[PDB]
């Protein structure tokens, strides 16, 4: 009845997809062999004729190496090999390669799986994309999908968890190009767009979890926790249940402003949890701390157009009414005038689960926050600057015009990043 289709494009998307699809099969007792020893899993699975529970996800990539890992990993007994999609060559950080040339031959395949994965649902909440902007597959291909999606459904909601090219740390050199080219073609198609970044979650691993060896698995674990929190209202009971429909209407004021931030709390190891009682106020305080955010953006330079808090575990709704009151009274937290309102709070009776061999602890309370703050226009300006700093020299351009592109889309996508940016200040 309440079912979501989770897509994982690029390398990072299918990397966190390993964590999320490890958490879920653990949270619901699903064994790696499909089967478990009501509606508790329907959102994420499809019980077969007898016994097995197949996850309703889609792993897509052009690099064969990683999808071939889950093919041999312990979780090969879960996914129907119709879900795992691969490709001979890769995109190699070119937009056209993912978008113009290679993408067009395989979209007819991926879309043929969704039409085979959507009809299985009678109540489809909305798509759930896992992107990684800055590369060829993630940006190039992912953008090519959403167009094929919106022409198909349109009426359906499109949600996206895209990691974003950090300002400081950058493993690529060309990512400003395809990132800008991604943002243009996704905007008129995505309905809401969450954003995150590794560097922030790197610090998050340092300050609170206190680990000096952060690898990609840890970050992917945290994204599993966040999303496990968001979907609890879709797959569990609790006061003030939330669904995607409610979520998107009270969080996107204008069609363009949908780029949003995130945060999680508590983020605590086994020991400091033993020296802690975890009052609902402390958790909702850290949740609004700009350091606990998952993006290197400062919300204290803008105003929260809206916020959405999803709690977890043992919470009673007066405390939420109490804590949010304490916050709306402070001064560091700004809001825009036309919304004296701006909060959509939710509770769930189901506590957060922990993964054996994982990094977090067993806690009875947990809070996640998603805010749409106009201060987000800042990180969009750095990328606005790096493009022109390099597009003047026309560096690396021969690749793009050499793979079925032109200079126009460089200009075209450029203005929308100015047209978007001016809109982020008209709300002031």
């Amino acid at each position: 009845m309440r079912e979501v289709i989770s897509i994982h494009i690029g390398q990072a998307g299918i990397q966190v997809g390993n964590a999320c699809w490890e958490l879920y099969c653990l949270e619901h007792g699903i064994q790696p062999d499909g089967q478990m020893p009501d509606d508790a899993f329907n959102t994420f699975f499809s019980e077969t004729g007898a016994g097995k529970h197949v996850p309703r996800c889609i792993f897509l990539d052009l690099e064969p190496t990683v999808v071939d890992e889950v093919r041999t990993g312990t979780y090969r007994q879960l996914f129907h090999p119709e879900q795992l999609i691969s490709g001979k060559e890769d995109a190699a950080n070119n937009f056209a390669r993912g978008h113009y040339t290679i993408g067009k031959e395989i979209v007819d395949l991926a879309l043929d799986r969704i039409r085979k994965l959507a009809d299985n649902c009678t109540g489809l909440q909305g798509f759930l994309v896992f992107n990684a902007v800055g590369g060829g597959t993630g940006s190039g291909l992912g953008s090519l999908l959403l167009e094929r999606l919106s022409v198909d459904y349109g009426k359906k909601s499109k949600l996206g968890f895209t990691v974003y090219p950090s300002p400081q740390v950058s493993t690529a050199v060309v990512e400003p190009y395809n990132s800008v080219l991604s943002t243009h073609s996704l905007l008129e198609h995505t309905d809401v767009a969450v954003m995150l970044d590794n560097e922030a979650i790197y610090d998050i691993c340092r300050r609170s979890l206190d680990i000096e060896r952060p690898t990609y698995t840890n970050l992917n674990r945290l994204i599993a926790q966040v999303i496990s929190s968001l979907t609890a209202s879709l797959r569990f009971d609790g006061a003030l249940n939330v669904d995607i429909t409610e979520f998107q209407t009270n969080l996107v004021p204008y069609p363009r402003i949908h780029f949003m931030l995130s945060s999680y709390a508590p983020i605590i190891s086994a020991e400091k949890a033993y020296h802690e009682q975890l009052s609902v106020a402390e958790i909702t305080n850290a949740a609004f701390e700009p350091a606990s955010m998952m993006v290197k953006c400062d919300p204290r330079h803008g105003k929260y157009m809206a916020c959405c808090l999803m709690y977890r575990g043992d919470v009673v709704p007066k405390d939420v009414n109490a804590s949010v009151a304490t916050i709306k009274t402070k001064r560091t937290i700004q809001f825009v005038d036309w919304c004296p309102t701006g909060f959509k709070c939710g509770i769930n009776y189901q506590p957060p689960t922990v993964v054996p061999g994982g990094d977090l602890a067993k806690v009875q309370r947990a809070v996640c926050m998603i805010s749409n703050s106009t201060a987000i226009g800042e990180i969009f300006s750095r990328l606005d600057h790096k493009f022109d700093l390099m597009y003047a020299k026309r560096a690396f351009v021969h690749w793009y015009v050499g793979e079925g592109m032109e200079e126009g889309e460089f200009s075209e996508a450029r203005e929308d990043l100015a047209a978007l940016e001016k809109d982020f200040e008209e709300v002031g």
């Binding site: 009845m1 309440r2 509606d39 009678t122 109540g123 909440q125 009971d237 006061a239 003030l240 249940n241 669904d243 995607i244 429909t245 409610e246 209407t249 009270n250 969080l251 996107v252 004021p253 204008y254 069609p255 157009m305 809206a306 009673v316 709704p317 007066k318 009414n321 949010v324 009151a325 005038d337 036309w338 919304c339 004296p340 309102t341 701006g342 909060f343 959509k344 709070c345």
Partner: protein, 428 residues
């Protein structure tokens, strides 16, 4: 005779009714099986007001539970008193409410109304002398606001003579558990005024106070607040169900409380409210219950009566007492704070009384008030509506269902006209 049909729209309306149909069910001594197991014939005389005869001597509640997203109705059915409801007295649609008042009242409402009308008429004729209707709304959400008012308009045009109650829970002035709250608040208010007769307004904030200070609860959950609303809703119709030396139908409450066909928003409170400790010190006397019912705290509406003026008022007592006491008490208070009352009404109170007490208690009371102080509620909603409408934020959602901008203008004006009414007779 005097049968009452009951509606439950929205999540909260589906939830408070779970209590209202749980409290009543034990008052008349029936079990979750539907079989009566009380002691007195009095439970059986006027049992037909809330229930229907069933095969094997069972009683099912004459209730209707309408809500999109049937996920919540599974809870009540799994609840302790969910086995009494007729499973054909459940209507739902898989799509989420979205709280876009339009889709709740224009697109998705339109799909279910024809089904709901088939259910109401199915049990409207099950009454020998149908007294009136009563609902359970939620102005913030889109289910109760959209569909309920959409249903209300349908009811009124096919049952104009009967009386439509409304136990609507009003958004809060301080906390906002959603964002688009003022929008759906007004668009419902623009429909209540013309198609309602008596509309209580209650708010979780004052519910938190009554639970916090007086009852000394440590953790008010949603059951307790709903446990309170259950009590008042049970106290209102004690005359229609039980003997009374001064009985009180609803229609005589109507004429005795609204002088004008538009000043029909009330304010409520229950009595006695005592923690366990004070219960062994307090003594049950008529003077106790009336000062407490007359305090400005028990008002579950988030308004201060000291800032307005009681046009009319009423009190319903239950428990064997002396009717002179209640006669002079209301005469004393009407004298003392003669500035809170109007002049052009000589006596502006109606003191009803019942012979049958509550289940475990022996005395009790309940207050109703139509004071102009409630005009502060609608002024607060106005500033939130006009500010965002001044910016047209979140508005593409509403126009996304064929709506226009006139409906926002009219709904604003109508509430503006309404608050003006409550000012004329408020001569300070």
């Amino acid at each position: 005779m005097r049968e009452i049909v009951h509606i439950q729209g929205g999540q909260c309306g589906n939830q408070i009714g779970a209590k209202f149909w749980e409290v009543v069910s034990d008052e008349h001594g029936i079990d979750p099986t539907g079989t009566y197991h009380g002691d007195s014939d009095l439970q059986l005389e006027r049992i037909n007001v809330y229930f229907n005869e069933a095969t094997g001597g069972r009683y099912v509640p004459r209730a209707i539970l309408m809500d999109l997203e049937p996920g919540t109705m599974d809870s009540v059915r799994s609840g302790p008193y969910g086995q009494i409801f007729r499973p054909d007295n459940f209507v739902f649609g898989q799509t989420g409410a979205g709280n876009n008042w339009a889709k709740g009242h224009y697109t998705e409402g339109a799909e279910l109304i024809d089904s709901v009308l088939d259910v109401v008429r199915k049990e409207a004729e099950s009454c020998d002398c149908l007294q009136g209707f009563q609902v359970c709304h939620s102005l913030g959400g889109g289910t109760g606001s959209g569909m309920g008012t959409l249903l209300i308009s349908k009811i009124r045009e096919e049952y104009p003579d009967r009386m439509m109650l409304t136990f609507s829970v009003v958004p809060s002035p301080k906390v906002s558990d959603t964002v688009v709250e003022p929008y759906n608040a007004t668009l419902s208010v623009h429909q209540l005024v013309e198609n309602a007769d008596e509309c209580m307004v209650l708010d979780n904030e004052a519910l938190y106070d009554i639970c916090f200070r007086t009852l000394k609860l440590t953790t008010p959950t949603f059951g307790d607040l709903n446990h309170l609303i259950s009590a008042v809703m049970s106290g209102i119709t004690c005359c229609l169900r039980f003997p009374g030396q001064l009985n009180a139908d609803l229609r005589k409450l109507a004429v005795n409380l609204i002088p004008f066909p538009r000043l029909h928003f009330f304010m409520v409170g229950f009595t006695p409210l005592t923690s366990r400790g004070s219960q062994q010190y307090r003594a049950l006397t008529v003077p106790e219950l009336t000062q407490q019912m007359w305090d400005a705290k028990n008002m579950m509406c988030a308004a201060d009566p000291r800032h307005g003026r009681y046009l009319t008022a009423s009190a319903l007592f239950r428990g064997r007492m002396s009717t002179k006491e209640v006669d002079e008490q209301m005469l004393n208070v009407q004298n003392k704070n003669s500035s809170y009352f109007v002049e052009w009404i000589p006596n502006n109170v109606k003191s009803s009384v019942c012979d049958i007490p509550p289940k475990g208690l022996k005395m009790s009371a309940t207050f109703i008030g139509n004071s102009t102080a409630i005009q502060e509620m609608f002024k607060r909603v106005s500033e939130q509506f006009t500010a965002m409408f001044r910016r047209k934020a979140f508005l593409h959602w509403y126009t996304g269902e064929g709506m226009d901008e006139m409906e926002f203008t009219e709904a604003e004006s109508n509430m503006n006209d309404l608050v003006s009414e409550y000012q004329q007779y408020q001569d300070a």
